[PDB]
Design a protein around this ligand. Sequence first.
Ligand code: AKG
Length: 427
Amino acid sequence: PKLLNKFDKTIKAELDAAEKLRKRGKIEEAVNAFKELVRKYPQSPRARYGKAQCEDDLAEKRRSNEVLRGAIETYQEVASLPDVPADLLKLSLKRRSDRQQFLGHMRGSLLTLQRLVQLFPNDTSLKNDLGVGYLLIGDNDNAKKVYEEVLSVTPNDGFAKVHYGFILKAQNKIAESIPYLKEGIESGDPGTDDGRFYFHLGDAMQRVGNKEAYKWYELGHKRGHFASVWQRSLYNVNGLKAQPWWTPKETGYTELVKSLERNWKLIRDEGLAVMDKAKGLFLPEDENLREKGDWSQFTLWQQGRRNENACKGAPKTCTLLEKFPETTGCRRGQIKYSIMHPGTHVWPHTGPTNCRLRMHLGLVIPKEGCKIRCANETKTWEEGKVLIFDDSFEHEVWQDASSFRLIFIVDVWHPELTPQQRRSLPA
Ligand SMILES: O=C(O)CCC(=O)C(=O)O
């Protein structure tokens, strides 16, 4: 790196020393070092970069946002100093942009990336990063405009390609997006080996019915992005038994299964009564996972918090679940009624965590046409009986019956999580 300017050049013995007290883990000595040099050598750009770098790490150690803000201003100050090395300038502002992104000053970071591109119009790597600035604030139109400029000069930049495909996919151009995602990943370009882009590729493919997408999930696994080709949840705890379908006995939560099966008509009636007397408390489910049809849910507990307004509506049922904190205390689950109507298709998808099991109590199940697949096994519900699967495995759902299907969904902690784990995990 061209990081010693003439202005700064002639202090290297002193400059280098500050670098040693930092590199030795004595940033406190090191921070205070450079500061004097700012006093002593005020215009040195390298004297001001190091300052920022000291307090940047000083912020890492103290884990302090406020301190880090200090460093962000100081990285900037480098850029004001006159007669600065280009290599050094780039370094300080790139880091500023990133530390700003870290703290969530997304538009502030975008503003810095805008500068960096004015100052290095032939650095396509910075144009790439600018595109990310735009995505991070929601301006996909300008992000699209950026990757098109890159790709017009750099036809084969895979970073630009995978982001370009993301963007297309996000504008509902699913099929156009797939070759971009494939080519950008295949390039192995830096930044393309990202779990996010296998996810969107395989999704897109699944949504255009191309079978080749499991190949890509399987690769994401062998790259470490997915627990397996089927188990693709993000927030995971290692060493939890991973199987798609479970039985009551296998989970140990047999008392819960029994309360549910045995009082099932009561659970049904209180949901059926909400459909009648307050249809509005069923909200539509994920429009993103709903290919077509009518699919709605009525939540009682979300992430171990009882919706108090909802237990007024189905009171005995809430009373029943109070006896079972493996579910009501599942900070990584919900407890909800779910109604699917004819002509509904739920795209393949997985849940966010392997730290819960999903139980489904059948309440109103048409005698034909409702099925659910989890990994390679497809099954159907029975009124009054309970299914259990690990919704961190890809699952998919169809409603091709002639009347409505109502179920009751009940998340439990994954049975192998210990008490201290259940207490400590964030939701
Ligand atoms: O309501 C349903 O049948 C869909 C369930 C589902 O996709 C899920 O439980 O994660």
